Design a protein around this nucleic acid. Structure first.
Ligand SMILES: [Mg+2]
Ligand SMILES: [Mg+2]
Ligand SMILES: [Mg+2]
Ligand SMILES: [Mg+2]
Ligand SMILES: [Mg+2]
Ligand SMILES: [Mg+2]
Ligand SMILES: [Mg+2]
Ligand SMILES: [Zn+2]
Lengths: 196, 92
RNA sequence: UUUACUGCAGCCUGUCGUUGGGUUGUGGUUCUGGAUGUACAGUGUAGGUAGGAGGCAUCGAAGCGGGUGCGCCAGCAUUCGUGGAGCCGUCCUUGGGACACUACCCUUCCGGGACUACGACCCUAACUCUGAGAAGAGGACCCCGAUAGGUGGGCAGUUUG
RNA sequence: CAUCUCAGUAGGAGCGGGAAAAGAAAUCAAUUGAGAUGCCGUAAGUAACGGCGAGUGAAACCGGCACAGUUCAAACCGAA
Protein backbone atom coordinates (compact mmCIF):
# COMPACT_ATOMS: atom_id res chain seq x y z
CA UNK A 1 0.00 0.00 0.00
CA UNK A 2 1.39 3.39 -1.06
CA UNK A 3 1.67 4.93 2.40
CA UNK A 4 3.38 8.01 3.81
CA UNK A 5 5.92 7.85 6.61
CA UNK A 6 3.51 9.73 8.86
CA UNK A 7 1.47 6.54 8.79
CA UNK A 8 4.44 4.51 9.98
CA UNK A 9 5.13 6.95 12.82
CA UNK A 10 1.44 6.78 13.74
CA UNK A 11 1.57 2.99 13.84
CA UNK A 12 4.74 3.01 15.93
CA UNK A 13 3.11 5.26 18.52
CA UNK A 14 -0.16 3.29 18.34
CA UNK A 15 1.10 0.74 20.91
CA UNK A 16 4.19 2.16 22.64
CA UNK A 17 4.72 -0.79 25.00
CA UNK A 18 5.25 -3.27 22.14
CA UNK A 19 7.67 -1.57 19.73
CA UNK A 20 11.07 0.11 19.69
CA UNK A 21 9.48 3.17 21.32
CA UNK A 22 9.76 1.59 24.78
CA UNK A 23 13.57 1.74 24.76
CA UNK A 24 13.46 5.34 23.55
CA UNK A 25 11.11 6.03 26.45
CA UNK A 26 13.68 4.55 28.82
CA UNK A 27 16.41 6.87 27.55
CA UNK A 28 14.22 9.97 27.20
CA UNK A 29 12.63 9.88 30.65
CA UNK A 30 15.94 10.59 32.42
CA UNK A 31 16.74 13.65 30.29
CA UNK A 32 13.17 14.86 30.72
CA UNK A 33 13.30 14.48 34.50
CA UNK A 34 16.47 16.56 34.64
CA UNK A 35 14.67 19.47 32.92
CA UNK A 36 12.30 22.10 34.26
CA UNK A 37 8.57 22.69 34.22
CA UNK A 38 8.35 24.22 30.72
CA UNK A 39 10.90 23.69 27.95
CA UNK A 40 11.15 24.80 24.32
CA UNK A 41 12.02 21.99 21.91
CA UNK A 42 12.89 22.57 18.26
CA UNK A 43 11.02 19.65 16.69
CA UNK A 44 7.85 17.88 17.85
CA UNK A 45 8.38 14.46 19.38
CA UNK A 46 5.56 12.98 17.24
CA UNK A 47 5.43 14.52 13.77
CA UNK A 48 2.16 12.96 12.59
CA UNK A 49 0.13 14.14 15.58
CA UNK A 50 1.47 17.68 15.29
CA UNK A 51 0.72 17.88 11.56
CA UNK A 52 -2.78 16.58 12.29
CA UNK A 53 -3.38 19.26 14.92
CA UNK A 54 -2.34 22.13 12.67
CA UNK A 55 1.45 22.35 12.78
CA UNK A 56 3.49 23.79 9.92
CA UNK A 57 7.19 24.55 9.53
CA UNK A 58 7.23 28.36 9.55
CA UNK A 59 8.36 31.22 11.73
CA UNK A 60 6.15 32.16 14.64
CA UNK A 61 5.16 28.57 15.49
CA UNK A 62 6.61 27.20 18.73
CA UNK A 63 6.38 23.82 20.46
CA UNK A 64 6.97 23.19 24.16
CA UNK A 65 7.10 20.23 26.56
CA UNK A 66 5.14 20.89 29.74
CA UNK A 67 5.41 18.84 32.92
CA UNK A 68 2.45 18.18 35.22
CA UNK A 69 2.03 16.00 38.29
CA UNK A 70 -0.37 13.06 38.47
CA UNK A 71 -3.32 12.66 40.81
CA UNK A 72 -6.39 14.64 41.69
CA UNK A 73 -6.86 18.15 43.00
CA UNK A 74 -4.77 18.24 46.17
CA UNK A 75 -7.28 19.69 48.60
CA UNK A 76 -7.11 20.95 52.18
CA UNK A 77 -9.32 19.75 55.03
CA UNK A 78 -11.75 22.55 55.96
CA UNK A 79 -10.72 24.40 59.08
CA UNK A 80 -14.18 25.31 60.39
CA UNK A 81 -17.52 23.52 60.69
CA UNK A 82 -18.90 21.73 57.62
CA UNK A 83 -21.88 19.33 57.44
CA UNK A 84 -20.23 15.86 57.00
CA UNK A 85 -20.90 15.82 53.25
CA UNK A 86 -18.65 18.81 52.57
CA UNK A 87 -16.20 17.73 55.29
CA UNK A 88 -14.46 15.05 53.22
CA UNK A 89 -11.92 15.97 50.57
CA UNK A 90 -9.46 13.08 50.10
CA UNK A 91 -11.47 11.16 47.50
CA UNK A 92 -12.75 14.33 45.79
CA UNK A 93 -10.68 14.50 42.62
CA UNK A 94 -10.77 17.72 40.66
CA UNK A 95 -12.99 18.91 37.84
CA UNK A 96 -10.19 19.98 35.51
CA UNK A 97 -8.17 17.53 33.45
CA UNK A 98 -4.39 17.50 33.17
CA UNK A 99 -4.08 18.68 29.56
CA UNK A 100 -5.88 21.87 30.55
CA UNK A 101 -3.45 22.45 33.43
CA UNK A 102 -0.52 21.88 31.08
CA UNK A 103 -1.79 24.32 28.46
CA UNK A 104 -2.56 26.98 31.05
CA UNK A 105 0.97 26.79 32.46
CA UNK A 106 2.41 27.05 28.95
CA UNK A 107 0.23 30.08 28.24
CA UNK A 108 1.35 31.68 31.51
CA UNK A 109 5.00 31.24 30.50
CA UNK A 110 4.66 32.75 26.99
CA UNK A 111 2.80 36.07 27.30
CA UNK A 112 2.76 37.06 23.62
CA UNK A 113 1.84 33.80 21.83
CA UNK A 114 -1.43 31.84 21.79
CA UNK A 115 -2.13 28.16 22.40
CA UNK A 116 -3.44 26.00 19.56
CA UNK A 117 -3.49 22.32 20.68
CA UNK A 118 -1.51 19.70 22.61
CA UNK A 119 -1.05 15.94 22.87
CA UNK A 120 0.19 13.21 25.19
CA UNK A 121 3.86 12.27 24.91
CA UNK A 122 4.70 10.18 27.97
CA UNK A 123 4.15 9.46 31.63
CA UNK A 124 5.70 7.75 34.65
CA UNK A 125 4.81 7.26 38.30
CA UNK A 126 5.14 10.93 39.26
CA UNK A 127 4.71 13.03 36.12
CA UNK A 128 2.97 13.36 32.78
CA UNK A 129 4.33 15.18 29.73
CA UNK A 130 2.44 17.02 27.00
CA UNK A 131 3.59 19.12 24.06
CA UNK A 132 1.76 22.38 23.36
CA UNK A 133 1.77 24.08 19.95
CA UNK A 134 1.93 27.88 20.15
CA UNK A 135 1.50 30.40 17.33
CA UNK A 136 2.68 34.01 17.27
CA UNK A 137 -0.07 36.29 15.93
CA UNK A 138 2.11 39.38 15.32
CA UNK A 139 4.60 37.74 12.99
CA UNK A 140 4.23 38.73 9.32
CA UNK A 141 4.42 35.11 8.14
CA UNK A 142 1.32 34.29 10.17
CA UNK A 143 -0.47 37.43 8.98
CA UNK A 144 0.08 36.59 5.31
CA UNK A 145 -1.16 33.03 5.92
CA UNK A 146 -4.72 32.27 4.87
CA UNK A 147 -5.29 29.21 7.09
CA UNK A 148 -4.00 30.89 10.26
CA UNK A 149 -4.96 34.58 10.02
CA UNK A 150 -8.07 33.90 12.12
CA UNK A 151 -5.80 34.15 15.18
CA UNK A 152 -5.09 37.83 14.48
CA UNK A 153 -8.52 38.70 15.87
CA UNK A 154 -9.78 40.45 19.01
CA UNK A 155 -11.67 37.33 20.13
CA UNK A 156 -8.66 34.99 20.26
CA UNK A 157 -6.76 36.60 23.14
CA UNK A 158 -6.47 34.25 26.09
CA UNK A 159 -7.78 31.40 23.97
CA UNK A 160 -6.62 28.72 26.43
CA UNK A 161 -7.84 30.24 29.71
CA UNK A 162 -11.45 30.44 28.48
CA UNK A 163 -11.90 26.82 27.40
CA UNK A 164 -11.74 27.33 23.64
CA UNK A 165 -9.08 24.72 22.86
CA UNK A 166 -10.06 21.16 22.00
CA UNK A 167 -9.39 19.80 25.49
CA UNK A 168 -11.30 22.78 26.88
CA UNK A 169 -14.40 21.90 24.88
CA UNK A 170 -14.05 18.26 25.87
CA UNK A 171 -13.99 19.38 29.50
CA UNK A 172 -16.96 21.70 29.00
CA UNK A 173 -19.13 18.79 27.91
CA UNK A 174 -19.48 20.07 24.33
CA UNK A 175 -17.77 17.30 22.40
CA UNK A 176 -21.09 15.94 21.09
CA UNK A 177 -24.72 16.78 20.37
CA UNK A 178 -28.05 15.49 21.56
CA UNK A 179 -28.96 13.60 24.71
CA UNK A 180 -26.87 14.49 27.73
CA UNK A 181 -25.91 17.98 26.53
CA UNK A 182 -29.06 19.74 27.72
CA UNK A 183 -27.14 21.86 30.24
CA UNK A 184 -23.71 22.14 28.61
CA UNK A 185 -24.32 24.29 25.53
CA UNK A 186 -23.80 27.11 24.70
CA UNK A 187 -21.94 27.39 28.02
CA UNK A 188 -21.72 26.05 31.54
CA UNK A 189 -22.49 29.43 33.15
CA UNK A 190 -25.71 29.85 31.17
CA UNK A 191 -27.43 27.12 33.21
CA UNK A 192 -26.04 27.99 36.66
CA UNK A 193 -23.28 25.40 36.21
CA UNK A 194 -25.62 22.44 36.67
CA UNK A 195 -23.94 20.75 33.73
CA UNK A 196 -20.49 19.22 34.01
CA UNK B 1 -48.96 -25.69 70.36
CA UNK B 2 -49.26 -28.55 67.89
CA UNK B 3 -50.93 -28.83 64.49
CA UNK B 4 -51.41 -31.86 62.21
CA UNK B 5 -49.05 -32.45 59.30
CA UNK B 6 -52.05 -33.14 57.04
CA UNK B 7 -55.73 -32.29 57.17
CA UNK B 8 -58.71 -31.61 54.93
CA UNK B 9 -59.51 -28.00 54.05
CA UNK B 10 -60.99 -25.96 51.22
CA UNK B 11 -58.60 -25.38 48.31
CA UNK B 12 -59.23 -21.96 46.72
CA UNK B 13 -58.10 -23.16 43.28
CA UNK B 14 -59.79 -26.56 43.05
CA UNK B 15 -62.76 -24.99 44.90
CA UNK B 16 -63.22 -28.27 46.77
CA UNK B 17 -62.29 -29.81 50.11
CA UNK B 18 -59.27 -32.12 49.92
CA UNK B 19 -56.03 -32.94 51.69
CA UNK B 20 -53.31 -30.33 52.17
CA UNK B 21 -49.73 -30.44 53.44
CA UNK B 22 -48.52 -27.82 55.90
CA UNK B 23 -44.93 -26.59 55.93
CA UNK B 24 -42.78 -23.73 57.23
CA UNK B 25 -42.14 -20.50 55.35
CA UNK B 26 -38.43 -19.68 55.56
CA UNK B 27 -37.39 -16.08 54.95
CA UNK B 28 -35.16 -15.76 51.90
CA UNK B 29 -32.08 -13.63 51.36
CA UNK B 30 -32.33 -10.17 49.82
CA UNK B 31 -30.83 -10.03 46.34
CA UNK B 32 -28.36 -7.40 45.15
CA UNK B 33 -30.13 -6.42 41.90
CA UNK B 34 -33.36 -4.95 43.26
CA UNK B 35 -33.65 -1.19 42.94
CA UNK B 36 -33.06 -0.66 46.67
CA UNK B 37 -29.57 -2.15 46.32
CA UNK B 38 -28.84 -0.04 43.24
CA UNK B 39 -29.97 3.02 45.19
CA UNK B 40 -27.74 2.03 48.10
CA UNK B 41 -24.82 1.94 45.66
CA UNK B 42 -25.75 5.31 44.15
CA UNK B 43 -26.09 6.92 47.58
CA UNK B 44 -22.74 5.78 49.03
CA UNK B 45 -20.33 8.70 48.90
CA UNK B 46 -18.66 10.81 51.57
CA UNK B 47 -20.18 10.97 55.04
CA UNK B 48 -23.69 10.14 56.20
CA UNK B 49 -26.02 8.31 53.84
CA UNK B 50 -29.57 8.64 55.15
CA UNK B 51 -31.62 5.44 55.21
CA UNK B 52 -28.51 3.30 54.75
CA UNK B 53 -26.87 4.37 57.99
CA UNK B 54 -29.99 3.60 60.03
CA UNK B 55 -29.34 1.44 63.07
CA UNK B 56 -31.19 -1.90 62.89
CA UNK B 57 -34.47 -1.90 64.78
CA UNK B 58 -35.48 -3.87 67.84
CA UNK B 59 -37.77 -6.87 68.03
CA UNK B 60 -41.07 -7.97 69.53
CA UNK B 61 -41.51 -10.51 72.37
CA UNK B 62 -43.02 -13.21 70.14
CA UNK B 63 -43.24 -13.43 66.36
CA UNK B 64 -45.99 -15.06 64.33
CA UNK B 65 -45.86 -18.61 62.99
CA UNK B 66 -45.72 -18.32 59.20
CA UNK B 67 -47.20 -21.38 57.46
CA UNK B 68 -47.92 -22.40 53.87
CA UNK B 69 -50.76 -24.80 52.99
CA UNK B 70 -49.85 -26.71 49.83
CA UNK B 71 -52.52 -28.82 48.14
CA UNK B 72 -51.90 -32.46 47.24
CA UNK B 73 -53.82 -32.48 43.94
CA UNK B 74 -52.80 -29.33 42.07
CA UNK B 75 -49.66 -28.68 44.18
CA UNK B 76 -50.59 -24.97 44.41
CA UNK B 77 -49.91 -23.43 47.80
CA UNK B 78 -51.87 -20.73 49.59
CA UNK B 79 -51.22 -18.67 52.70
CA UNK B 80 -53.50 -17.66 55.56
CA UNK B 81 -53.36 -15.07 58.35
CA UNK B 82 -50.98 -16.41 60.96
CA UNK B 83 -51.23 -16.73 64.74
CA UNK B 84 -48.61 -15.88 67.36
CA UNK B 85 -46.95 -18.62 69.40
CA UNK B 86 -43.64 -19.11 71.20
CA UNK B 87 -43.09 -22.88 71.03
CA UNK B 88 -44.61 -24.44 67.91
CA UNK B 89 -44.45 -28.20 67.65
CA UNK B 90 -45.52 -29.46 64.25
CA UNK B 91 -47.49 -32.53 65.32
CA UNK B 92 -47.90 -34.80 62.32
C1' U C 1 -16.15 15.79 78.39
C1' U C 2 -17.09 10.48 76.93
C1' U C 3 -17.19 3.08 75.98
C1' A C 4 -23.98 8.80 73.21
C1' C C 5 -25.47 8.78 67.10
C1' U C 6 -23.09 9.84 62.42
C1' G C 7 -18.70 11.15 59.93
C1' C C 8 -13.57 13.32 58.67
C1' A C 9 -8.13 13.98 59.01
C1' G C 10 -3.57 11.31 60.93
C1' C C 11 -1.36 6.45 61.36
C1' C C 12 -1.01 0.49 60.32
C1' U C 13 -1.68 -3.22 56.45
C1' G C 14 -3.31 -5.96 51.27
C1' U C 15 -3.70 -5.06 45.80
C1' C C 16 -2.68 -2.12 41.05
C1' G C 17 1.13 1.59 38.59
C1' U C 18 6.12 3.64 38.74
C1' U C 19 9.34 -1.45 37.86
C1' G C 20 14.30 -3.83 35.35
C1' G C 21 18.07 -8.69 34.55
C1' G C 22 19.37 -13.74 36.64
C1' U C 23 19.33 -18.30 40.78
C1' U C 24 16.39 -21.98 41.63
C1' G C 25 11.38 -24.84 44.84
C1' U C 26 6.23 -24.31 43.08
C1' G C 27 1.65 -25.77 39.82
C1' G C 28 -0.83 -26.17 35.67
C1' U C 29 -0.21 -23.74 31.08
C1' U C 30 1.86 -26.15 27.34
C1' C C 31 4.72 -30.74 24.49
C1' U C 32 7.05 -35.22 23.30
C1' G C 33 9.28 -41.33 23.52
C1' G C 34 4.25 -45.55 23.94
C1' A C 35 -2.25 -46.41 23.35
C1' U C 36 1.25 -46.42 27.06
C1' G C 37 -4.95 -49.62 27.49
C1' U C 38 -2.30 -55.34 31.57
C1' A C 39 -6.34 -58.85 36.81
C1' C C 40 -11.50 -64.31 34.27
C1' A C 41 -3.09 -63.20 31.95
C1' G C 42 -1.75 -63.37 27.06
C1' U C 43 -1.29 -67.66 21.05
C1' G C 44 -2.06 -60.67 22.03
C1' U C 45 -0.79 -55.32 25.71
C1' A C 46 -8.73 -53.89 26.29
C1' G C 47 -3.33 -50.95 19.09
C1' G C 48 -8.77 -46.24 24.32
C1' U C 49 -13.43 -46.46 22.71
C1' A C 50 -14.14 -48.94 17.75
C1' G C 51 -17.81 -50.63 10.79
C1' G C 52 -17.80 -56.55 17.53
C1' A C 53 -13.45 -57.04 12.66
C1' G C 54 -8.82 -59.03 8.30
C1' G C 55 -4.22 -55.92 6.63
C1' C C 56 0.59 -56.90 8.01
C1' A C 57 5.00 -61.37 8.12
C1' U C 58 13.28 -64.12 6.12
C1' C C 59 9.52 -59.56 0.54
C1' G C 60 10.53 -59.10 9.12
C1' A C 61 7.53 -61.76 12.86
C1' A C 62 7.74 -64.50 18.24
C1' G C 63 8.31 -65.85 23.58
C1' C C 64 13.68 -63.41 26.86
C1' G C 65 17.38 -59.86 29.06
C1' G C 66 19.42 -55.02 34.11
C1' G C 67 13.97 -56.18 31.91
C1' U C 68 13.02 -51.20 25.61
C1' G C 69 7.49 -47.11 26.00
C1' C C 70 5.59 -49.57 30.29
C1' G C 71 3.37 -53.37 33.30
C1' C C 72 1.63 -58.63 36.61
C1' C C 73 11.01 -58.92 35.10
C1' A C 74 4.26 -61.60 31.27
C1' G C 75 5.01 -59.40 26.07
C1' C C 76 1.72 -56.66 21.60
C1' A C 77 7.00 -53.41 19.22
C1' U C 78 11.28 -55.00 15.98
C1' U C 79 14.12 -51.54 19.21
C1' C C 80 20.52 -53.00 21.80
C1' G C 81 19.83 -58.27 20.53
C1' U C 82 17.41 -63.39 20.80
C1' G C 83 15.51 -67.27 18.53
C1' G C 84 14.71 -67.03 13.03
C1' A C 85 6.14 -66.20 13.23
C1' G C 86 3.16 -62.78 16.35
C1' C C 87 -1.06 -63.48 11.54
C1' C C 88 -7.47 -61.94 12.22
C1' G C 89 -10.27 -63.93 15.72
C1' U C 90 -16.20 -66.46 12.30
C1' C C 91 -10.33 -70.95 18.66
C1' C C 92 -12.73 -63.29 20.53
C1' U C 93 -7.80 -65.09 27.07
C1' U C 94 -16.19 -65.75 23.71
C1' G C 95 -14.49 -59.31 27.34
C1' G C 96 -14.69 -53.96 33.30
C1' G C 97 -12.39 -52.70 28.52
C1' A C 98 -11.63 -58.48 23.80
C1' C C 99 -8.09 -56.68 21.34
C1' A C 100 -5.69 -56.56 13.53
C1' C C 101 -2.29 -52.13 9.80
C1' U C 102 -3.51 -45.33 6.68
C1' A C 103 -3.86 -43.79 12.99
C1' C C 104 -2.76 -43.19 19.59
C1' C C 105 -8.26 -37.04 18.00
C1' C C 106 -7.97 -38.76 23.70
C1' U C 107 -5.70 -43.53 30.71
C1' U C 108 -0.87 -41.06 29.92
C1' C C 109 4.06 -39.64 29.36
C1' C C 110 4.92 -35.51 31.68
C1' G C 111 13.72 -32.01 29.27
C1' G C 112 7.97 -30.28 31.37
C1' G C 113 11.24 -26.29 27.71
C1' A C 114 7.45 -22.45 27.48
C1' C C 115 4.34 -16.13 29.26
C1' U C 116 2.30 -16.26 33.55
C1' A C 117 1.42 -15.91 39.99
C1' C C 118 3.70 -17.07 44.54
C1' G C 119 8.18 -17.47 48.93
C1' A C 120 13.55 -16.62 49.29
C1' C C 121 18.42 -15.06 47.29
C1' C C 122 21.81 -12.30 43.83
C1' C C 123 23.06 -8.09 40.19
C1' U C 124 22.95 -2.88 38.46
C1' A C 125 21.18 0.55 34.64
C1' A C 126 16.00 3.06 36.59
C1' C C 127 15.24 5.53 41.37
C1' U C 128 16.79 7.73 46.51
C1' C C 129 20.59 10.31 49.95
C1' U C 130 25.44 12.80 50.45
C1' G C 131 29.11 15.90 47.76
C1' A C 132 30.95 21.98 43.61
C1' G C 133 32.25 17.55 40.96
C1' A C 134 34.95 12.73 40.39
C1' A C 135 32.68 9.52 43.42
C1' G C 136 30.49 7.02 47.63
C1' A C 137 26.19 4.47 50.18
C1' G C 138 21.43 2.03 49.40
C1' G C 139 18.28 -0.32 45.35
C1' A C 140 13.82 -2.47 42.21
C1' C C 141 12.98 -1.83 48.61
C1' C C 142 11.32 3.08 50.14
C1' C C 143 8.76 7.70 48.80
C1' C C 144 4.62 8.85 45.49
C1' G C 145 -0.78 8.31 42.70
C1' A C 146 -5.20 5.13 43.21
C1' U C 147 -8.11 1.59 45.74
C1' A C 148 -9.73 -2.07 50.18
C1' G C 149 -9.85 -3.14 55.42
C1' G C 150 -8.75 -1.53 60.44
C1' U C 151 -7.60 2.00 64.72
C1' G C 152 -9.05 6.97 65.47
C1' G C 153 -13.22 12.86 70.90
C1' G C 154 -7.10 14.50 67.24
C1' C C 155 -11.46 17.29 64.85
C1' A C 156 -16.80 18.43 62.87
C1' G C 157 -22.23 18.39 62.61
C1' U C 158 -26.12 17.05 65.96
C1' U C 159 -29.42 14.51 69.65
C1' U C 160 -30.10 13.95 75.01
C1' G C 161 -38.72 13.61 74.94
C1' C D 1 -31.88 16.54 62.38
C1' A D 2 -27.60 13.57 59.49
C1' U D 3 -29.32 12.24 53.01
C1' C D 4 -32.08 16.36 50.96
C1' U D 5 -32.74 21.92 50.94
C1' C D 6 -30.50 26.87 51.26
C1' A D 7 -27.31 26.46 46.21
C1' G D 8 -23.40 25.80 42.28
C1' U D 9 -26.12 30.69 45.66
C1' A D 10 -22.70 34.41 48.61
C1' G D 11 -17.47 34.68 48.08
C1' G D 12 -12.62 33.75 45.56
C1' A D 13 -8.62 33.08 41.18
C1' G D 14 -7.76 33.62 35.87
C1' C D 15 -8.99 35.65 30.99
C1' G D 16 -11.56 39.27 28.06
C1' G D 17 -14.95 42.76 23.86
C1' G D 18 -18.27 46.31 22.36
C1' A D 19 -20.61 42.52 22.76
C1' A D 20 -19.09 37.46 24.45
C1' A D 21 -20.22 32.01 24.29
C1' A D 22 -22.25 28.50 20.55
C1' G D 23 -22.39 26.92 15.58
C1' A D 24 -22.47 23.57 10.28
C1' A D 25 -24.84 16.14 12.87
C1' A D 26 -20.56 9.68 14.29
C1' U D 27 -28.04 14.70 15.51
C1' C D 28 -33.29 14.28 16.68
C1' A D 29 -37.10 10.96 15.33
C1' A D 30 -40.30 6.10 14.26
C1' U D 31 -42.33 2.51 11.37
C1' U D 32 -42.21 6.14 5.71
C1' G D 33 -39.68 12.01 8.44
C1' A D 34 -36.57 16.50 9.54
C1' G D 35 -32.02 19.02 8.12
C1' A D 36 -26.00 24.46 11.63
C1' U D 37 -26.29 27.83 15.97
C1' G D 38 -28.44 31.38 19.42
C1' C D 39 -32.85 33.88 21.78
C1' C D 40 -38.31 34.24 22.88
C1' G D 41 -43.37 31.23 23.50
C1' U D 42 -45.29 26.31 24.68
C1' A D 43 -44.70 21.40 26.16
C1' A D 44 -45.04 21.82 32.17
C1' G D 45 -44.84 22.05 37.68
C1' U D 46 -45.45 16.95 33.08
C1' A D 47 -41.54 12.77 32.69
C1' A D 48 -37.70 12.03 36.24
C1' C D 49 -35.26 12.39 41.46
C1' G D 50 -36.39 12.09 46.76
C1' G D 51 -35.91 10.00 55.22
C1' C D 52 -40.63 8.44 47.62
C1' G D 53 -40.95 13.24 53.23
C1' A D 54 -40.20 18.52 52.60
C1' G D 55 -38.95 19.78 48.16
C1' U D 56 -35.99 19.72 43.17
C1' G D 57 -37.16 19.41 38.00
C1' A D 58 -36.08 19.00 32.03
C1' A D 59 -35.78 18.08 26.70
C1' A D 60 -37.78 16.76 21.69
C1' C D 61 -42.10 17.77 18.48
C1' C D 62 -44.60 22.79 17.21
C1' G D 63 -44.92 28.80 16.47
C1' G D 64 -41.73 33.02 15.87
C1' C D 65 -36.92 36.83 15.46
C1' A D 66 -32.76 36.37 12.11
C1' C D 67 -30.48 33.55 8.19
C1' A D 68 -24.50 31.61 5.49
C1' G D 69 -21.52 28.46 4.75
C1' U D 70 -16.67 26.73 4.78
C1' U D 71 -11.07 25.81 5.94
C1' C D 72 -6.97 22.03 7.15
C1' A D 73 -4.36 16.52 7.74
C1' A D 74 -3.70 12.26 3.86
C1' A D 75 -3.69 9.92 -0.80
C1' C D 76 -1.08 12.65 -6.55
C1' C D 77 3.15 16.42 -8.04
C1' G D 78 8.31 17.42 -4.93
C1' A D 79 10.67 23.87 -3.86
C1' A D 80 7.00 25.19 -8.73
MG1 LIG E 1 5.62 27.52 37.51
MG1 LIG F 1 -17.15 34.27 18.62
MG1 LIG G 1 -17.96 17.16 69.87
MG1 LIG H 1 -27.56 23.66 61.58
MG1 LIG I 1 -6.42 43.44 30.89
MG1 LIG J 1 -16.62 26.07 17.97
MG1 LIG K 1 -30.42 22.16 42.53
ZN1 LIG L 1 -55.82 -27.89 45.01
Amino acid sequence: MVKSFYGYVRDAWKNPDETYVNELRWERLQVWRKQGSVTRIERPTRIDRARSLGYKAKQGIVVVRVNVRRGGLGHVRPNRGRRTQKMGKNKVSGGMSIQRIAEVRADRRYPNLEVLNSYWVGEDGKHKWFEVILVDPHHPVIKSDKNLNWVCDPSSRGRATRGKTSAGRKGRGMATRGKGTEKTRPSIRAYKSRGK
Amino acid sequence: MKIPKRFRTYCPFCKTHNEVVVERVKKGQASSMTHIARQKKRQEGIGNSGKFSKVPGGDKPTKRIWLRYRCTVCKKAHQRPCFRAKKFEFKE
